Amino acid sequence: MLEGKVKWFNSEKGFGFIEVEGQDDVFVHFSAIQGEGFKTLEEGQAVSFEIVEGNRGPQAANVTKEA
């Protein structure tokens, strides 16, 4: 398990991208990266997830809000 740190969020445009040291940008979406209730997230959004490796590169899948 590891943590990711937004590079910028586009929840409104359909998604937000995460960026983590030692890894690449973790794709983020209010469906898996969601959190307590359907809320929006701004820069600084720290989340917890497990990046895996799929055709378009590594990516988080069942991410969540850091605490």
Task: For CA atoms 54, 58, 59, 60, give the dihedral sign.
Answer: positive
Question: Buried b vs exposed e over 20-32: b needs ≥16 C-beta within 10 Å?
Answer: beeeebbbbebee
From 67, 56, 61, select the one nearest 18 (Cα to Cα). Answer: 61
Technique used to solve these coordinates: NMR
Token pair for 31: 């469906």
Q: What is the DSSP letter of 34?
A: -
Which residue has 């983590």 as its token pair? 20
Domains and CATH numbers, the chain: 1-67 (2.40.50.140)
Q: What is the DSSP letter of 16?
A: E
